[PDB]
Amino acid sequence: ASVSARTLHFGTSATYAPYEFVDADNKIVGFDIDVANAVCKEMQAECSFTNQSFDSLIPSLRFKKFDAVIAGMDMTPKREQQVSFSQPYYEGLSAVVVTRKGAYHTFADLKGKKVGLENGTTHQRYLQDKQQAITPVAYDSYLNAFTDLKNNRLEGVFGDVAAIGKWLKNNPDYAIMDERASDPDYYGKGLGIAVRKDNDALLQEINAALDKVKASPEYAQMQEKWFT
Amino acid sequence: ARTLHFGTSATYAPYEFVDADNKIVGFDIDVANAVCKEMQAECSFTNQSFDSLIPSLRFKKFDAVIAGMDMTPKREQQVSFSQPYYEGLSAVVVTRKGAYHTFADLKGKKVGLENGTTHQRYLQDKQQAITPVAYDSYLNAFTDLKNNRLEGVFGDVAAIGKWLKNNPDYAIMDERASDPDYYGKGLGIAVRKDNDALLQEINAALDKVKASPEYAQMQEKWFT
Ligand SMILES: NC(=[NH2+])NCCC[C@H](N)C(=O)O
Ligand SMILES: NC(=[NH2+])NCCC[C@H](N)C(=O)O
Ligand SMILES: [Zn+2]
Ligand SMILES: [Zn+2]
Ligand SMILES: [Zn+2]
Ligand SMILES: [Zn+2]
Ligand SMILES: [Zn+2]
Ligand SMILES: [Zn+2]
């Protein structure tokens, strides 16, 4: 007596092209969206997305506001204490600073300067722990961070290379800084889909679906589309 | 520190084949090597006919098998498979260009394939008016086709497509087979049923490999 296909409710933060972002007609799109839709199709489910701040996603997941989270989210040990992750669906990569082109080369060069980043991220934890001479400025959206960079309120913005690279396409006055951050205490954990801790049946359905999606020519094409 | 011994059948470009330097190469070779790297293991290959791989795996001749092998129900009774590492796709016949259009047109004719394959079982069960000619090796089947001893060779679209690139007198037949009862299961790495510790390591390795940009590049190398 069901009157619709099962619907899997995903939480995300659509501030982060090419992983997830909002297009011209206010629709959520990106690599993660294509992945989640493909997973839902394998599960014979419809997909629903809720867009909210990145730092609120794990808490809302735990509060049962949605079934799963996909948001370019590294499977860190800290997050693994709070949620259950799927198998990695994509690799965790190196973090970069974007600054005015030629203005900074290294983290040392940023001594005493303001660098914007997102609340709740690997990037925030890395800068706070390992680059204490730099002032981290927390935002609930990389979009506000970029605005503040362009208005000279910040000297840099620190995030995933794909996201920064994407932003740079429309901002040639800026450049990825030479020194990158790769510390494996912070970086290199794969991207995962998160579910609540006591939700193994759903998690294993998601894993079984990812096994299939990741073996598909379409999944190679998703990477080609979003990461080239 | 460790070696993983794979059994394969290097008769099936681009999955696995012998190149002009007498070395075994291909998509499956790259995948198995990547799996071995994640497991911090050396990679070793044994080359033998496709229909002997599973009996040999059970006999403990090697640890695993990778050979563009579909994960069929009949095989799962005999061995354990990893998660899929590539999709099982459509099967096609190659013939002299324009000579045949449908399986119906091949009535009472000889069509080559490897023994023990999905393609064999589909022909025998679904195209009984066609004579199956079972080979140990696709290489020999192709040779017979060029020598007019067969009317067609029946196999996976990538392998047939790859052979075609150097044989322009031939063509993929109009009617293709993708019957879900024989095709579409997905390719697996096979291990022995009582070797679940090894199976779990390979699955954990594949989880990482399949999440990698390198694995997308592998497909772009071998399938485009
Ligand atoms: N949708 C987003 N805003 N994602 C931000 C992710 C940043 C980084 N990859 C992390 O795991 O913390
Ligand atoms: N290495 C080979 N000769 N592989 C043949 C595979 C043919 C077919 N995909 C099967 O599973 O039966
Ligand atoms: Zn729900
Ligand atoms: Zn749109
Ligand atoms: Zn917040
Ligand atoms: Zn798994
Ligand atoms: Zn061995
Ligand atoms: Zn034989």
3-state helix, strand, coil in chain A (%, to 5): 35, 25, 40
Q: Nominal resolution in Å?
A: 1.9
Using the structure block, give the residue that is written with the tokens 């990695």: A88
- Determine the distance separating the centroid of ligand 3 and the alpha carbon of A212, expressed in angstroms: 22
Amino acid at B142: F
Q: In the sheet that B42-47 helps form, which strands lie side by side, from edge to edge?
A: B42-47, B3-8, B64-65, B190-191, B80-81
Q: Is B153 helix (H, G, I), strand (E, B) or coil?
A: strand
Domains along chain A with CATH numbers: 1-93+188-228 (3.40.190.10), 94-187 (3.40.190.10)
Q: Is B12 in the pocket of ligand 2 (CB under 6 A)?
A: yes
* Experimental determination technique: X-ray
Beta bridge partners of B3: B42
Q: Which residues of A touch B223 (CB under 8 A)?
A: 217
Count CA within 13 A, CB hemisphere, residue A106. 3
Q: Taking chain B, what is the end-to-end CA distance rounded to the nearest angstrom?
A: 36
Ranges of beta strands (E only) in chain B are: 3-8, 17-18, 24-25, 42-47, 64-65, 80-81, 91-96, 110-114, 131-135, 152-156, 170-172, 190-191
Beta bridge partners of B134: B113
Q: In the sheet that A135-139 helps form, which strands lie side by side, from edge to edge?
A: A135-139, A114-118, A156-160, A95-100, A174-176
Backbone angles phi, psi at B45, to 5 degrees: -115, 135
**Residue B170: alpha-carbon gap to chain centroid:** 21
Residue B170 token pair: 């031939």
Q: Which of A91, A212, A217 sits opposite B211 (nearest CB)?
A: A91
Strand bridging mode A28-29 / A46-51: unpaired
- Determine the distance separating the centroid of ligand 5 and the alpha carbon of A140, expressed in angstroms: 5
What angle, rounded to 10 degrees, do the helices at A217-227 and A31-42 form? 160
Q: What is the largest CA-CA distance in chain B?
A: 56
User: Which of B28, B207, B223 is the best substitution to test chain A (most A C-beta atoms within 10 A)?
Assistant: B207
Q: Is A123 helix (H, G, I), strand (E, B) or coil?
A: helix
Assign residue B4 a region: left if phi > 0, alpha if psi is -120 to 50, beta otherwise?
beta
Q: Which of A224, A208, A181 is nearest to B203 (CA)?
A: A208
Q: Is B120 in the pocket of ligand 2 (CB under 6 A)?
A: no
* A108 in contact with B, Cβ within 8 Å: no
C-alpha–C-alpha distance, residues A227 and B141, integer Å? 42
B112-to-B54, B65, B123, B158 alpha-carbon distances in Å: 21, 24, 10, 16
Q: Taking chain A, what is the end-to-end CA distance rounded to the nearest angstrom?
A: 45
C-alpha–C-alpha distance, residues B181 and A106, integer Å? 59
Count CB atoms within 10 A of the CB of residue A6: 11
C-alpha–C-alpha distance, residues A67 and A203, integer Å? 10
Distance (Å) from the alpha carbon of B26 to chain A's nearest alpha carbon? 17
